[PDB]
């Protein structure tokens, strides 16, 4: 039970700034879905990151591409998710920086799956928005341990702090799910491209 003070403080500050954080997340996702030049940029920097993780901006692009791509496997169930986690494990064996990214993405997959199998559809989507608000605040400050901690809390079923954060943003949670639907094709393609690139540098 409970959570570390750094995680409590990230939740407190994200709730104070939740109109800003949730609004910026939704608008970035809308811009990405409607701007093909932004999609090409994320994809080419993600491919560079597979060959060389040293630049934080390239590794961020790899994380964004895989966080969008993972929605496919999550909606396909246990076999697809196990294959996706197997791919992340192979990615993590490449270097210590790749391992840090892969460990974060594995926790994000597990958080999604816990929510979907235990909550109603609307509570699932709203809790996810509150969780990602805290995660984005932590990552923007370079605090990767706090970001992963928030995901672990949801894996264990402690959804209530994150649902509570996003309750007044239920409409934005629905719109963020409408936007993911426009990205299904992008995600399937980029996942196949990353899988091929990882095989090449093994
Ligand atoms: Mg290299
Ligand atoms: Mg460099």
Author numbering: -1 to 200
From the paper:
Here we present rotamer inverted fragment finder–diffusion (Riff-Diff), a hybrid machine learning and atomistic modelling strategy for scaffolding catalytic arrays in de novo proteins.
We obtained crystal structures of the four designs: RAD13 (kcat = 3.8 × 10−5 s−1), RAD17 (kcat not determined), RAD32 (kcat = 1.1 × 10−2 s−1), and RAD36 (kcat = 6.2 × 10−5 s−1). The crystal structures agree with the design models, having backbone Cα RMSD values between 0.68 Å and 1.2 Å. In the active site of RAD36, we observed density for three distinct conformations of the catalytic lysine. Both results highlight how the prediction of activity needs to account for catalytic contributions beyond the interactions specified in the catalytic array and their conformational dynamics.
